């Protein structure tokens, strides 16, 4: 009844659109869930409306002392993770010629850099059997104006899957990447989009969970395309 | 706690495997089920195996007559189709150098020809908003000894997911590919396979489930590789 | 200066538009092209335009004794085969709703059918370490309206590059598909692609040139697209 | 017989391996080559063994202020650019439990930001219709034990000529990415690698030529695996 019964879930970006649609679909299918987000306000309102089974921590993963707070609360309230979902950042676009280090460097560290780390800190806490799933994009295969370095970043996302599939094989964790299309988060793909509308962060949430649930659990190192056929046509 | 409850799906090869391995899944999930499948005896088997919400039709996918009589069996049973799973057929092994034209015609007749008259022919029953799968295969993207004309009749079946994807959207029936690497069916692929083993069917079976589900609702026109890891490192 | 000298190449559907623009830079190469198709007047025309090295042969590719009746003069000619071109066929529109049994044998065996056959009955006459040339199409990783067997028959002729890589790589043959988008022969496809325009002959004849002579040794079971970017943005 | 006859290229990475053996083709083929790189030594070395119609320049392309002193000398004594291959930099090892900051660091400041910049502070000399080639890499499609960063930077650099195509081809300039093996520089990679041997310099500088000359003319945007076959079957 419940794919995901008693398992425990850590969800960055787990403050709003998808992380929290994630959360809150796991809580229903009987995990209890991390949100690990940067703002208080929003980690406490979010808390409230997923309501049961759910610790909200407040960390930048793109720190490393702030990771291992993160893991010392995670070992301390369930001592253990069976999934982790890594959905971190925003976009921030520049064509090519406005491109500054410092663009650069924002992106970089949260898409990257900051997963990197992320991962890394959890394998200590990481079940034989567990699932990882990062968030790459659309953006990953397409050319798309002042896309620049978002899309450079979750090309390496979703490089990080296959080489971590490799790595992480002899204790089988499963690492897969999810490359969503536009999701409504509080125009003109909607229109190159064979389903014809942007999705929900509902409808993400579940492709998530089947790589979360052992439904996916002859599957590894894929990128799973949620974009309505965008990339597919 | 039901995924498919009171939704019509047909499978064809419903009779052993993969097929009928999902048609036990999807009957556990609440639909009801058509199995498909050229031999009675086997298909008998099947359906007492399945044991309840399951009708047997004896059905050559190669045969444009055969599949009238499926269609029409279906419409006076049930009157529509959510899910049609397409998974007819084996794998017949021949070198470029060995291939004759009868071995040609084996492969493409049942991989590619009788799907698309399959699909054409369910066309008047799907309900919108249904879900349609095919078979593909690693190997569509693989270059494997004495593979040639399997090979290329399911990357041409992993091709009309992206065709029917764009010709159907207009009722927003999602079509989609999985290609299994190695499964269980009564030892190499199983060597360079990070997950280091075969598939059980049921992991295939949960890999279409997620496709008829939805769960996969903002999903179309992809190819999942449920390989445990083959292709994807 | 002369990058094919004394190569000997054969090219099916060199009577026109793509296949005559690659005899061409051929023979400018140095090469001795024969060119294969359908037309005696179309053939005898392109051997004028050609000039010097070239043999004309009337043979419709999808007949097994034609095959043997090109390759016996290739043979009794000029020995052994160093490049072989494989450019027959053209497009035929159907949507689902509308294929017929006749429109898909009509397209798969042109493009199928006798391409294997083809590349079959070559063999024999190979040298080692030769080129083979397959057209494929942008149309192959599409879902173009009404592509339906088009599209599926040339994901499937790419299939077959990676197939006989690996099985001719004993005699150092290499194999690869060239995947033409828009080109200009005697609309919409140029709206999307980013070089603004379709593309002409003689850019495909030199994308073909670079799979055939020495320049690609180190490229093997590779798509090549020539779209001006259609395909990858 | 002269196919880049009076182009400009730069080439970083130009002291050795690919970048040396290709600034050695493009004046074979009649350009006027800036090799830069990191070693005087090593550099002197190089330009004395192409011998003529060089100017070695000394760079490191992680630094702005680096560029801008090349882009000054290319511009006082050439004028303008017709090709720029990015060839800079080298593997790192470090499996996901070894990974650094600094590691981190090292690979993409060279990989990613330093390509970026290079890239954009050309883009005043660059003349329209120019070619842009990217090294990128099998790594950036494989999962690779210990190769976390640098396969993950590949794909990064994979994704910039996706983006670069569709911001540059209001210019006219081609951008593509070339994609080596196993290329012999001063054991198994080779193992099921279809030529059954590494690539030699030379063949890469082949293929990064076609991308640089007319004959790529209509290729925009590709990935060009050139790597015997190992990506691809």
Same mark, same amino acid.
């Given at each position: 009844?419940?794919? @995901? ?13 998808? *992380? &929290? ?74 064509? &090519? ?27 200590? @806490? ?8 990062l968030t790459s994009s659309?953006?990953g295969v ?12 979750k090309a390496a996302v979703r490089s990080l899957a296959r ?6 094989? *002899? ?6 990447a999810?490359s ?18 942007? *999705? ?8 998530? @969970? ?11 190192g894929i990128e ?5 056929? @965008?990339?597919?046509?």
């Amino acid at each position: 009844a419940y794919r @995901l019964l008693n398992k425990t879930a850590v969800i960055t970006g787990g403050g709003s659109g998808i *992380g &929290l649609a994630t959360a809150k679909r796991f809580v229903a299918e009987g995990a209890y869930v991390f949100i690990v987000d940067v703002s208080r306000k929003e980690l406490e309102q979010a808390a409230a409306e997923i309501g049961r089974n759910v610790t909200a921590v407040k960390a930048d993963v793109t720190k490393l002392e702030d990771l291992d707070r993160l893991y010392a609360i995670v070992r301390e309230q369930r001592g253990s993770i069976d999934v982790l979902f890594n959905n971190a950042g925003a976009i921030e676009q520049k064509t &090519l010629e406005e491109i500054t280090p410092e663009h650069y460097d924002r992106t970089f560290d949260v898409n990257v850099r900051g997963l990197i780390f992320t991962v890394q800190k959890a394998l200590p @806490l990481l079940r034989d059997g567990g699932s990882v799933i990062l968030t790459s994009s659309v953006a990953g295969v397409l050319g798309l104006q002042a896309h620049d370095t978002y899309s450079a970043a979750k090309a390496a996302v979703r490089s990080l899957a296959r080489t971590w599939t490799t790595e992480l094989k *002899g204790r089988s964790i499963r690492v897969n990447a999810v490359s969503p299309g536009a999701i409504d988060t509080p125009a003109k793909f909607a229109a190159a989009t064979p389903l014809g509308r942007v *999705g929900r962060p509902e409808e993400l949430a579940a492709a998530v @969970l089947f790589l979360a649930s052992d439904d996916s659990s002859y599957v590894a190192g894929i990128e799973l395309f949620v974009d309505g056929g @965008l990339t597919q046509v």
